[PDB]
Each structure stands twice: as structure tokens, then as C-alpha cells.
Structure 1
Amino acid sequence: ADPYDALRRRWLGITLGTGYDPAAEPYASRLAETGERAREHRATMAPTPTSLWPGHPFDPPAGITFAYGRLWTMTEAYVQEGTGATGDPALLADILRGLDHLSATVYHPATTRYGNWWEWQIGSPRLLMDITAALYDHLGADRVAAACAAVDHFVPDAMLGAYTGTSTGANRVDLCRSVALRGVLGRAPAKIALARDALSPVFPYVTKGDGLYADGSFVQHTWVAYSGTYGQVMLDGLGRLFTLLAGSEWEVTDPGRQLVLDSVEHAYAPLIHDGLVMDTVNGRAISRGYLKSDDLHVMRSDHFHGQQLIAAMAVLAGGASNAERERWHARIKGWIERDTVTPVLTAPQFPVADLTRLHAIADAPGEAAPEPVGHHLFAAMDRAVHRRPAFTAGLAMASDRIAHYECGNGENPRGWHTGAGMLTWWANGTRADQYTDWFWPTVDWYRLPGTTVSTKRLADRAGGEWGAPKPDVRWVGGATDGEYAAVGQHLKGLGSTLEARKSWFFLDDAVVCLGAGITCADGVPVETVVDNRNLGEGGTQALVRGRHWAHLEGHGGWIVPGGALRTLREDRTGAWSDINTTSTTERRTRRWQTLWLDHGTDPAGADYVYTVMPGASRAALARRAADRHWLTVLANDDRRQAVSVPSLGLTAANFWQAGTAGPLTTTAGASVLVRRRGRTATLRVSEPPRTGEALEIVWDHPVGAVLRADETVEILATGRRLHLRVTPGVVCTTHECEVTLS
């Protein structure tokens, strides 16, 4: 009996929290508030054949999970000290009433599942198990048995068989969560072992489909870049389950578990900036904001999502090694310090158990870590992240592997161009609320920052749901040394005949943006969005313009032909319900500064060059624009885009096909980055088309000897020039070669 009772107790410690004083803030106010929500939920519960709370019918099935969510708040009120309702028998009776009503009317084995599978197999059962676990002694054997039987009906063993469909990645972990608890609570050792075993296929790095990739990428729904939401769900359930089972007969022993720990710093941390997790990896969730069904009324946003991912790291850290835990805690202290948008330590979505874990990290000894300066190219999910002292940026692309966007369940119907070379960024050391402050419900979805698009009007959900629309292109990726990068996207526009070559060269204080082969036949204008910045409500940040630059006060600026540049400052009013059928309808106004180049109607091989300098002063921008020397554009056409930046000793080129640009030649499409440092140089090359066919590179610079080369890099000649052959692989890995110069 005791191994099950011990697991149940350990689950309650994880779920309800441990070793805090309920009288201390902020526990005291969160518990009081839970009491209050419980009291009102109790007062309004109204069992009917089709609902348990008015306005929340069992069809759609969200209305069932909705009901379990409220019974869970009631349960919390009942079992936690400090709530004003702890151990109140009348609260207890109403919980039991609601459970019995759900068990009688909807959540039971005579129901043939309808509507969203997720509500039945993930949303409701995890809550039902949690409630059952918290109230175990008061429930009696028939209720415990009937709760286990319902789980068995909606989540049978076969749901934890084939690693496919609705059972991969975050979904796999969520299914295991309910099956494990049903095993604990129903004293069914085989269900516990099943849930532990079924975690194994989540661990290994994949090269296609759902999961974690060796370059740190994370994919869910087969084609969607998703580290921020699904990746967090996976990380959260894994940490919960590792901690649950540790020390028991069903402890997770798969050594692949280490890959999940590794992913903290390698997959997730780079996407977190001052507490937010970047909207480029948040998929359809960027459209949620205030949800109609959320009794807490907490705005979803990049900051909400990052806070949830920080909380998952805090649970996971409990089972990490000392050295890992020490690094995670230091990064988390850093995020807690720098998040002035939504203070982590009092974040209103957090129950006391997360509050306690984060306060433990806060009070612990050690210094807060900064985000390391560097570049992270998440090539498997067509994402790049760049950090410099002056700014942080996240780029979103799309390819034959990665959808333009996801819409589904009423969410994100206008996200078409979020993958069309969207460049998002924050000025470092300023408030990081750019995309948080009612950005998505007010933005013009036809003018997303960095993108090139047809202005052709599109239908809500155009291209299809769940990541269905992908451009028919291969060359999307880049090459990086870990600090700077060349990134390129062969663009085909969504719902449009637009085609373009877009490149970005991520440097020490700027991103150089090249566009070429811009060709469309839609019969309407084509635009490249130099930027589009949310100014906040009533913003009065000055826009200053010069001959070849523009600067936005508080934000940064752009070097761009001043006569070609179009601008517009305007107020835009919108609501989350405009972009999500499940969100509130309250409307707010945000002022916008938008900047764009008009490529005319039906362009044929149109182009652009512009440089963004996030975080830069007006004067730094005026200097860089008047300086002819700092940057040479080697080539900007549909066969190759390439720059030379002598202050960095840097040459960078995206070769859309075999060709030459400045001192670089390639025999096949490739991305190449050369960096000279005194008497040595390192040459880096990737193959974004991912054919895996060998190609050669020549770099026209005298070279004495090779200090080192990856096993995939064969040296063909040195002397007057460097000549390499590279066997590139099919995941767009960057291969390197270091040489002595003559």
C-alpha cells in the first residue's frame, strides 16, 4: 500500500507545494484569492444534463475541462491553509457533488468522444487525477475507481503505444501524466510502468517531425516551430514526472533523460529574453491574450509564456546535477531580475507551489547571470536568435519543413506572414514589452516587421490549419560561428505568387538585410516592411529622418534610402477576439510606427538593402549611414547575396546556386562565413538546401596551413587560395575549417 501512498504524497508536494509559510507574502494573498474564487464557484455551480456551470455546456468538450478546472480551484481552497475555506465540509460536499455530476452526465465510459480530443485525453483527465489525488481519503473507493475507469476509457493503453499522431512530444508527456497518476491512485503498477516506459521515445533527438533536434530546435504538429508553448508543456510534464517517480520502483532510468536536461540551456534558454519566450516559437498561442475561460484573467503573452517555461525549468532543476542546477538557477535569477514587464516572483498565474520553487531560486546564493552575447541558429525549425550588448533579435522563416504559421481551434486566423522573414527585436536594457503590450490584437497583419509580402488580401485561415501551409522551397537556413551569422530564406508567399530571396547578416550592432529576385504576378503592390513598431498607447516617441536613415526614439533605427522609405504613424484599435474565437472582446488602442519599401505592382526581380540598428542612438545611426566604408554589398541578386564587413574581418555570402561573390566561390547552394582574426581565419559553411551532396568552396586569400578542419571538410589546396570540399549532411550543420594566413 505504502509505495502508492508515498507516490501520491510526493505528487501533492509537487502540485500543492511544500516548506513555505502560508502567512507570508505572496503565498498569503494567492491562497486568499483562491479561497475567494472557490467561494464564488461554489455559489454558482448549477448541475444540468448538459453543463455544470452556466454558459459552459459539455459540448464543446472544453466545457467539461472548464468544470474540472473550477473543481480543482475548489479542491485547492479545501486542502490548502490560508484560503478561508480549509477543511470546510460544505465546500467538500459541493466538490463531491460536481464530481459525481460530471461522472454521471459526461465523463464516463458510455460517452463516445466528440469534439477536440485534447479536452478528453489531456485537459479533463489531468485535472480529475489531481482532484482525486488531493481528496483521496474523502472520496471513497467507488469514486476513485470510477475516476480510474474514465481515464482507462478515454486514455487507453494503446494511446501510449505507437509514437505517432496525437501521441508525440508534449502530447505524449501529457498522456503519461494521467496514466501515471491513474496507476498511482488505482494501485495499478502496470499503468505506472506503462507511463514511465512511454516517456522513452520523447528523449532522442529527431531529424524530422515532432521533438527536440540536435541543433536545439523544437517542433510540434510536425511542421511548427514550437519551443515556447508545446516545448514548455513537454518540459513541465517531464520535470513533474521525473520528480514524481524518482526513488520509486518506476523511476525514469532511460539515459536519454539527460538529453532533456541538456535541452534547458541548448534549446530553451536562448529563446528567453528578460523573462519572455519569443513569439516566433509560440505558434498560434500569440493570439490568446485574455481568454474567455480564464477565471484568473491573466493576459497570455510572450512574458506569460516565458514565465511558464521558467517555472518548468525550476521543477526540472530539482532532479538535475549540482553543476546544471547551479547554471539554471543563475539564469533564472537573471530573468527574475530583468523581467520588469511581469515580475516573475508575483506572477498572477502561479499557484503557491511554483511561487515556492521560484522564491527558493531567488533567495539562494549565487549571482544572477546575463544572457550570453552570441548567436543561435535553430536551423531545424527555421529560427535564429541573436544577442549583442545593444539588442536581442528573433527571426522567423518558413520552408518545406516548417509551416508559414499555424491556425486552429479558432486561433491565429491572420498569422499568414509570421514566417515571411519576420524579424522581431528588443533594445537591451529597456522594458521588454514590445510584443507584449497589445501588439498582436492591434497590428496590421499585412505589415509584420522584416517581411516581404504581397499586399493581396487573404482569407482568415488561408493555406489551412495545424501547419498545413508550407512554402515549396528547400534553401532556408544559414551559417554561424556562434557569434555572427549569414541567414537566408527562399521565400514563397502565402496565398500568393510572390517569390523572393531574403538574407540577414547578424553583426556586432546591426542586422544587414538584403532582398533580391522579388517577383510577383498578383496584380497588386508588393512591400518589404523595414519595420513596424508598437509605440504603446498614445506614444510620442520621435521619429527623426535623414537623407539615408530613420531613427525611432527609445527603439533604434534603420539605414535605408530616405526617399524610397514610406512611413506611417497611426492609432489602431483591436481586441483579442479579433484574432481568437476564445478570447475576450475588450478593445484597446495602440499607436504604431510603420516603415516600408514599396516594390510596385507585379515586380520582376526587385530588390532592397537596409540595415537595422536596434538599440542605437540617432547619432550612431547618422554616422553609420554616411560611412561608405563599413559595409560593402558584394552581390545582391537571386543567385547570391553577400557582404563584406572589414571592421569584423568578415565576409558572408548566401549562394542561392553555384557561383562566386567577392573572394568566395561555391559549386552548389551554400551559406559561407569567413572571419579573419590577425594571422588566422576560420571559414564556416553550411548547405541549407540539405541535398547532402558534396560541394567545394574556394576562398581567394593566400593561406599557409590548416590548423584544423571538421571531419566533413577535405582540404584540396592551400597556397594562393583555400580550396575545400565538404560533405555537408542534411540538417544544415555549419562545418568549420581554421587556417593560417599568408
Structure 2
Amino acid sequence: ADPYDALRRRWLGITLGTGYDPAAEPYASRLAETGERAREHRATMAPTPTSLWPGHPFDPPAGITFAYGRLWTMTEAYVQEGTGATGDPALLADILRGLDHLSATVYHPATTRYGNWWEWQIGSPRLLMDITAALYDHLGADRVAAACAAVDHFVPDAMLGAYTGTSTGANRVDLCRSVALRGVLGRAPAKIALARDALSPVFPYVTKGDGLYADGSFVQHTWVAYSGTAGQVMLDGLGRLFTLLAGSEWEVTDPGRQLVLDSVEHAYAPLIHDGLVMDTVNGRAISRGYLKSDDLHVMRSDHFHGQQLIAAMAVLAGGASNAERERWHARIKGWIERDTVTPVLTAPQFPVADLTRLHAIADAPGEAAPEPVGHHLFAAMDRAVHRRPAFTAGLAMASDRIAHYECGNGENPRGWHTGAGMLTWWANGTRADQYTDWFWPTVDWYRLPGTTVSTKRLADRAGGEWGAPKPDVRWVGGATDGEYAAVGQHLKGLGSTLEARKSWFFLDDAVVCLGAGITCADGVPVETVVDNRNLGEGGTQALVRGRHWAHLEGHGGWIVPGGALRTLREDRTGAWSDINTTSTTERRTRRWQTLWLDHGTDPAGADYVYTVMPGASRAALARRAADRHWLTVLANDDRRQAVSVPSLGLTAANFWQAGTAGPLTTTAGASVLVRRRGRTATLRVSEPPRTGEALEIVWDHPVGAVLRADETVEILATGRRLHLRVTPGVVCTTHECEVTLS
């Protein structure tokens, strides 16, 4: 009918959800809880020249936002079925008095802003608009017009002008949201259109600093890999607006919008496993667990963050094409089926609108999609993710672009080595709670899985907060064909003289890990942590040691040739408060199985070889341990590290400098993957140092003719050898060339 009516109602569908049964669980419990809190706020509401609730003053301005936040909850009790206060006139009268009092006292066009800009331009107006929308029919024309004028005053048009300062990224999105709503409720088309338009500069990929990158990475705080939690914010915020405006005269039509939509499968989905989103992209938030300020007592964890990120995808899906919706829902349905740790459909933190969208997804006909097999290298944030039938793995590195770790606001004080080549993993089709079940509050932060560290003692927050500490290196990245990968990290340890070359070769049922050039002058032992597994409370999983191997029941195994493997099993006790000033002091005990290699004190060019086989059975492990022809280490030194795997027709090489490994030669630091498939071979090369200088590769193998090659790849010779000249760019893109053999 009317276009403003269609938006208002669509927004209420988005904010409150639609078409569920308020008498069914879990809705019924969420609605009752909103009722119960609304009664407590109504009982305590007390209007005075300086507050609306006692103890929350209007200066500092957080007191204003705090007041609107409670009137919102009161509104929800008013409009929703099953709260035990649905449609109660006395509750209505109290929301009114509270709104009038804020309007009359602080939040109006005569007040010149004080303190934190965010409370006036984001916190408060986003709630005022939602209240005005939910209570549109009960508020009268003067209140509606006065809410609009207040928004015009605190968020003028100019706040949607220059894309800078407090008006970028998530801030820009949330500013548009208020303007858009003010347009809808005040029936002002120009404000809607300005909201629509001011979304545009959020769409393009960035190439430095905060934002989404073309390769799918997502960075925040300038240096910190942050897809896990900051991604939730950008998808939910944009998701709300794309959905609101879809089908209307102000629908987003900017072709950039496709980069937002593409991000769901290209940036976020690969970091989601059976419901969790990987702690390698959760920054300091890995340390929260039970928050002291959280009255619902819901543990933060990789699953909790995953649930939020999944919910946000389900929001954006109303703003996408049909074909997109049907792919995204199929993925979400798969996650909903596989997450046995924190059941998505009954997650306690979900409000009913999120519950509604996720149940509609689970109740629809259509595939539950499995996570596809493959490899995603997020080079711009130094992250990799590998999936095979037997397991899922996530790797965290650090470079001159990406912090070793973030600490700040009293969180994550010991996260120093989470960037030191940390290799996290899950065995597929087992409960996916390895990092969820009080992993972080109990772990030994000096022996994170996969890493090489000096055992040197470090202070809490060593290196500085907010992602200040970055190793002084360039070569961090790799090459992939979307299925297998050569990844390498030139490591300088946090707060240490440690320097090391670490490589990972992600194969079909294993990751082969090579290290070389391990050099330290700290005066203390240096370790490589072959693994460190949380076993849960009182775990009795058998550890069996053949081989040069060990196998951990329920987990997988490790092959370490040349012996000297150490192991320790021990119980460790801790509390989230040990790693977060804002978390509770409740304690748990967890048992741990830790494996490592001891490089001695002051190593000078030490090295290692090990293979981890996540998810492997005992028997698969004993056979691979006895098999000495499946893998050849072609080179393992500080000039180059390289493997040959005949069963995959695979040659993989990290060149730390010009050199030769097996049949490959390069003029410069490069990562190279060659795959031979009968009569065809594909070559992939990237340049992780990112100098962008042209480099040459020679593959000593007879090749017939070139089938295809990227523009950036020049063919210098075929016949007896293949000789390429690659102009590689500065973002560690993998360049491709496919040739017929021989």
C-alpha cells in the first residue's frame, strides 16, 4: 500500500520477528524474561532533573542511552504476546512519561552534545527510533515528530557526508540506520534516500587498515585479524538495512553492494565449523567467557561468537537474491544440524527475531549443506583454514601487517603467542568443543599448539595493547589451489630475540610442518609445540606411543621422525578472571595432553619435521608412521623448505630467498605449488614478501603446451622445462598456469 508503512512494518519484522508461536519454547521463555525485566524497570523508574533511573545520571551521556535501553525493553513487554504485560495501559503510561522526561530534559534540539559523541549519534537514537516504530500507533503525532527532530539535531545530514572520523565502517552503518528510520517514521523520502546513498562508501574493499579485503580478510584496530566478532557487526548492521530497503524505491542499487553479499561465502563461512567461528579471528574476545556484567550467565566462546555470526548471516539473507538466500540457508541449516555444543535453535542469548529467522531456516525444505572440502588462505590477515573429510584446521600467523595479538580493556593479557604459527584443529564429526570447554582459562599460554617460542617469561600485555606488537618481517603467506596449500611464516618471537622459518603443507589427511633456521639468544630454552590438546575435565583418552609417533584417542596423531618428542599430561585449574579483568572468578579444572620438541638454550639454526594427522585413527597413524616413501622432504633450511608427495602428484616449496628445491628454481622469495594430474599440470606461485618485483620460476619437467595462464604470468619457455616470469602484485595473490605434459 503506502511505502512508509511497508518499511515500518518490515523493520518491526526485522526487530521483533514475525510469524512464530509465542506459546512454544524457546520463544515463551524469552518473552517471559522480557516481561520480568520490564516490571523491574517500571517499579524503579524515577524521573529527576538528572536521571530517569537512580544511579544513572544524564552526565556522562551513557545515562541517556541507558534510559532509552530500558524503555525499549519496556516497549517489548508492551507489544509482544506472552510477556504477561502485553497491551497493559499502565506500562504504556510509564514508557510515555519516561520518553517525555528524556525529551523534555536532555534529548532534544536545545541540548548541545557533551562527552562521548557515540551515545548521542548512535546509542540513544537507534533505540529512540526503534521505540517510536514499535509504539507508532500509541505515541501521538507530537512525540513522533519530536523524536524525528531530535535525530535531525544529533545526526545532521553532514554526519552522512564525509566518510572520515566517526563516520566510517560500522559507525557509518549505524548512522544511516537512524537516518533511515527517521525517514520512515517522519515520512521524509529525502532522509531515506540519503541513508541509502551514504552506505556506498562502506562497500569497497580496503587495501590497508580496517575493513574487508579482496581476499576475504577482515581487519580491525588497524592490525588485528577480526572476522569473527567484527564481522558479526558489519553483517548484522548492513544486513538490517539491505533487508529493510529491499523491494522499495530506496533499495540499495549501488553495484558495490555485491561485495557485501559475496563476503558471506568468501570471507565468513570458511571460518565457521559446526557452528563455532574460529578463535584465530576473535582477537581479545577469546578471553571473555563468563562476564561479570552478564545477568543471563551465557559463556562467551568460539560457539557463542559463531552463533552471533550465523544469526547476522540470516539477517543479511533477506537482502540478497533468491539464489544467494537458498545457498546461505543451506549452509546455516548444516551448521544448525552439526552444532551439538551450543544448540543454535535454543541459544539463550538470542532474542525472538533471531530465533524466528533461524527456526524458519531449519523448518524450510532444502539441503543441509556440509562444509565444503578445501583451503582458504586469508593472506591479508595472515590466516589459513583447511578442510578435509577427516578434519578442519585454522592457522594464525603475524607479520609487519598483523599483530601477534590484541590485548586492551583488561582482556587477553597473555595472548602473546596466538600469532606464533598457532595451528588449531578439530576432528570432523566429533563434538567440536576443543577450544570452547574452558580451553583459554586453563591453557598454558607459553605452549600454544603448533607454535615455536622462546620459554622466556613475559609480562601481561607485553608488546603493548591494541595490536601494537608486530614482528619485523615481510615473508608471511603462501600459495594454494583452493584445495591444498604451502604456507610459511618468517617468525620473530614476541618480546624475544627468537627468529625461525615455519612452513605448513596442508595435504589430504595431514599437515606436514617444517621448521628451520631456529635461532635465539635469550639464554633460555626454545620449544616447538607439536600439540597441546584440552581433554575436558578428568579426561581418560588413551595416548599411545609407537615409535616416532603418538596417537591421542578421540583426537588424532603425530609423527615425529628423529625422535626426542616430549609429552606431559596434567590437570590445570583457572578462571576467566585470570585473563580478563571483566570476567568472573569461577574456576574449573581441565586435563591437558601436551607434546613438544625442545630445541635447547640458544639454538643456532635448529630445525624440525613433524606431521600432524588430525582426526586419524590409531591404525591410520601407525601405518603412515611406518611408510617411508609417501613424503620426501626436498629441503628444510632457512633458504627453503619443500616437500614432494607422489600420491598427490604434488611438489610444494616455500622459498625464503632465491634458490632451488627439487625440480623448482626461483629468483626470489615465493611460495610454489605444482600439481601433476596424468597428462596435465598446474603451477601456482605467490610472492609473500609483497615487493611486487617480477620473479622467475623454472620447473624442470618436460611440458607440451600451455592450456591457460593468468595475465600476470609470462611463459618464457616450454619443451624441456617450463620457465615463467610472474609480475606478482603486492597482496600475495596466487597466480596460475596450466600446461599439458611432457
TM-score between both structures, scaled by the size of structure 2: 0.94
The range that moved more, 517-526 or 97-106, is 97-106
- What is the Cα deviation at residue 165 of structure 1? 4.2
Give, in whole Å, the separation in 2 of the partners of 1:122 and 1:607: 53
The answer to whether the 8 A contact 1:476-1:490 is kept is yes
Paired residue secondary structure (1:425): strand
Residues 587, 89 of structure 1: CA spacing in aligned structure 2 closer, same or farther, 3 A cutoff?
farther
Paired residue secondary structure (1:704): coil
- What is the Cα deviation at residue 183 of structure 1? 3.3
**Cα deviation code 1:548-598 (max 9, x no counterpart):** 112111111111258522222222222223222333332222222222222
Give, in whole Å, the separation in 2 of the partners of 1:574 and 1:61: 37
- What is the Cα deviation at residue 221 of structure 1? 2.5
- Does residue 237 (structure 1) correspond to residue 237 (structure 2)? The answer is yes
Residues 533, 603 of structure 1: CA spacing in aligned structure 2 closer, same or farther, 3 A cutoff?
same
The answer to whether the 8 A contact 1:686-1:734 is kept is yes
- What is the Cα deviation at residue 490 of structure 1? 1.2
Paired residue secondary structure (2:76): helix
**Cα deviation code 1:371-404 (max 9, x no counterpart):** 1111111111111110000000111111122222
The range that moved more, 195-204 or 176-185, is 176-185
Give, in whole Å, the separation in 1 of the partners of 2:481 and 2:603: 35
- What is the Cα deviation at residue 59 of structure 1? 7.7
The range that moved more, 214-223 or 100-109, is 100-109
Give, in whole Å, the separation in 2 of the partners of 1:176 and 1:397: 35
- Does residue 31 (structure 1) correspond to residue 31 (structure 2)? The answer is yes
- What is the Cα deviation at residue 54 of structure 1? 6.7
Give, in whole Å, the separation in 2 of the partners of 1:702 and 1:95: 80
The answer to whether the 8 A contact 1:169-1:220 is kept is no
- What is the Cα deviation at residue 8 of structure 1? 2.3
The range that moved more, 637-646 or 552-561, is 552-561
Residues 56, 577 of structure 1: CA spacing in aligned structure 2 closer, same or farther, 3 A cutoff?
farther
- What is the Cα deviation at residue 98 of structure 1? 4.5
- What is the Cα deviation at residue 441 of structure 1? 1.9
Give, in whole Å, the separation in 1 of the partners of 2:631 and 2:58: 62
Structure 2 unpaired stretches of 5+: none
Paired residue secondary structure (2:644): strand
- What is the Cα deviation at residue 156 of structure 1? 4.4
Q: Which residue of 1 aligns with 2:365?
A: 365
Residues 137, 457 of structure 1: CA spacing in aligned structure 2 closer, same or farther, 3 A cutoff?
farther
Give, in whole Å, the separation in 1 of the partners of 2:516 and 2:289: 36
- What is the Cα deviation at residue 727 of structure 1? 1.0
Paired residue secondary structure (2:417): coil
Q: Which residue of 2 aligns with 1:62?
A: 62
The answer to whether the 8 A contact 1:379-1:731 is kept is yes
The range that moved more, 703-712 or 327-336, is 703-712
The answer to whether the 8 A contact 1:550-1:562 is kept is no
**Cα deviation code 1:309-357 (max 9, x no counterpart):** 2222222222322222221121111111111111111221222212221
**Cα deviation code 1:120-163 (max 9, x no counterpart):** 54444323322232223444556545544554565444443333
Q: Which residue of 1 aligns with 2:739?
A: 739
The answer to whether the 8 A contact 1:168-1:211 is kept is no
Paired residue secondary structure (1:564): coil
The range that moved more, 87-96 or 7-16, is 87-96
Residues 554, 662 of structure 1: CA spacing in aligned structure 2 closer, same or farther, 3 A cutoff?
same
**Cα deviation code 1:414-449 (max 9, x no counterpart):** 222221111111100001111111222222222211
- What is the Cα deviation at residue 269 of structure 1? 1.1
Structure 1 unpaired stretches of 5+: none
| Superposed CA RMSD | 2.5
**Cα deviation code 1:18-47 (max 9, x no counterpart):** 122222333223222322232334345566
Residues 511, 51 of structure 1: CA spacing in aligned structure 2 closer, same or farther, 3 A cutoff?
farther
Residues 139, 410 of structure 1: CA spacing in aligned structure 2 closer, same or farther, 3 A cutoff?
farther
Give, in whole Å, the separation in 1 of the partners of 2:626 and 2:698: 33
The answer to whether the 8 A contact 1:708-1:737 is kept is yes
- What is the Cα deviation at residue 168 of structure 1? 3.0
The range that moved more, 202-211 or 51-60, is 51-60
Give, in whole Å, the separation in 1 of the partners of 2:99 and 2:585: 31
The range that moved more, 225-234 or 240-249, is 240-249
Q: Which residue of 2 aligns with 1:625?
A: 625
- What is the Cα deviation at residue 644 of structure 1? 1.0
Paired residue secondary structure (1:318): helix
The range that moved more, 228-237 or 474-483, is 228-237
Residues 165, 441 of structure 1: CA spacing in aligned structure 2 closer, same or farther, 3 A cutoff?
farther
Residues 548, 729 of structure 1: CA spacing in aligned structure 2 closer, same or farther, 3 A cutoff?
same
The answer to whether the 8 A contact 1:288-1:580 is kept is yes
Give, in whole Å, the separation in 2 of the partners of 1:148 and 1:326: 37
Residues 679, 461 of structure 1: CA spacing in aligned structure 2 closer, same or farther, 3 A cutoff?
same
- What is the Cα deviation at residue 370 of structure 1? 0.7
Paired residue secondary structure (1:249): coil
Residues 632, 59 of structure 1: CA spacing in aligned structure 2 closer, same or farther, 3 A cutoff?
farther
Give, in whole Å, the separation in 2 of the partners of 1:311 and 1:350: 9
The range that moved more, 683-692 or 450-459, is 450-459
The answer to whether the 8 A contact 1:174-1:234 is kept is no
The range that moved more, 624-633 or 176-185, is 176-185
The answer to whether the 8 A contact 1:545-1:562 is kept is no
Residues 630, 196 of structure 1: CA spacing in aligned structure 2 closer, same or farther, 3 A cutoff?
same
- What is the Cα deviation at residue 80 of structure 1? 0.3
Give, in whole Å, the separation in 2 of the partners of 1:251 and 1:380: 31
Residues 63, 508 of structure 1: CA spacing in aligned structure 2 closer, same or farther, 3 A cutoff?
farther
Give, in whole Å, the separation in 1 of the partners of 2:292 and 2:372: 38
Residues 404, 176 of structure 1: CA spacing in aligned structure 2 closer, same or farther, 3 A cutoff?
farther
- Does residue 393 (structure 1) correspond to residue 384 (structure 2)? The answer is no
Q: Which residue of 2 aligns with 1:340?
A: 340
Residues 407, 509 of structure 1: CA spacing in aligned structure 2 closer, same or farther, 3 A cutoff?
same
Give, in whole Å, the separation in 2 of the partners of 1:86 and 1:625: 67
- What is the Cα deviation at residue 253 of structure 1? 1.4
Paired residue secondary structure (1:178): helix
- What is the Cα deviation at residue 181 of structure 1? 2.2
- What is the Cα deviation at residue 599 of structure 1? 2.0
The answer to whether the 8 A contact 1:398-1:420 is kept is yes
**Cα deviation code 1:73-131 (max 9, x no counterpart):** 22211110111111123333443454456567776678787776655544443233222
TM-score between both structures, scaled by the size of structure 1: 0.94
The answer to whether the 8 A contact 1:653-1:673 is kept is yes
Q: Which residue of 2 aligns with 1:49?
A: 49
The range that moved more, 187-196 or 143-152, is 143-152
The answer to whether the 8 A contact 1:171-1:234 is kept is no
The answer to whether the 8 A contact 1:168-1:210 is kept is no
Paired residue secondary structure (1:52): strand
Give, in whole Å, the separation in 2 of the partners of 1:55 and 1:607: 60
The range that moved more, 111-120 or 229-238, is 111-120
- What is the Cα deviation at residue 65 of structure 1? 4.5
Give, in whole Å, the separation in 2 of the partners of 1:631 and 1:652: 11
Give, in whole Å, the separation in 1 of the partners of 2:102 and 2:587: 35
Give, in whole Å, the separation in 2 of the partners of 1:516 and 1:13: 57
Paired residue secondary structure (1:201): helix
Give, in whole Å, the separation in 2 of the partners of 1:440 and 1:182: 44
The answer to whether the 8 A contact 1:35-1:83 is kept is yes
**Cα deviation code 1:686-719 (max 9, x no counterpart):** 1111111111101112222222211211111222
The answer to whether the 8 A contact 1:484-1:508 is kept is yes
Residues 414, 626 of structure 1: CA spacing in aligned structure 2 closer, same or farther, 3 A cutoff?
same
The 5-angstrom pairing of residues 409-420 of structure 1 reads 409-420=409-420
- What is the Cα deviation at residue 274 of structure 1? 0.7
Give, in whole Å, the separation in 2 of the partners of 1:705 and 1:266: 33
**Cα deviation code 1:663-696 (max 9, x no counterpart):** 1110010000011111221111011111111111
Residues 138, 562 of structure 1: CA spacing in aligned structure 2 closer, same or farther, 3 A cutoff?
farther
Residues 527, 646 of structure 1: CA spacing in aligned structure 2 closer, same or farther, 3 A cutoff?
same
Q: Which residue of 1 aligns with 2:543?
A: 543
The range that moved more, 18-27 or 527-536, is 18-27
Give, in whole Å, the separation in 1 of the partners of 2:405 and 2:737: 36
The answer to whether the 8 A contact 1:704-1:719 is kept is yes
Give, in whole Å, the separation in 2 of the partners of 1:184 and 1:451: 53
Paired residue secondary structure (1:496): coil
Q: Which residue of 2 aligns with 1:702?
A: 702
Give, in whole Å, the separation in 1 of the partners of 2:539 and 2:390: 22
Residues 459, 98 of structure 1: CA spacing in aligned structure 2 closer, same or farther, 3 A cutoff?
farther
The range that moved more, 670-679 or 123-132, is 123-132
The range that moved more, 320-329 or 640-649, is 320-329
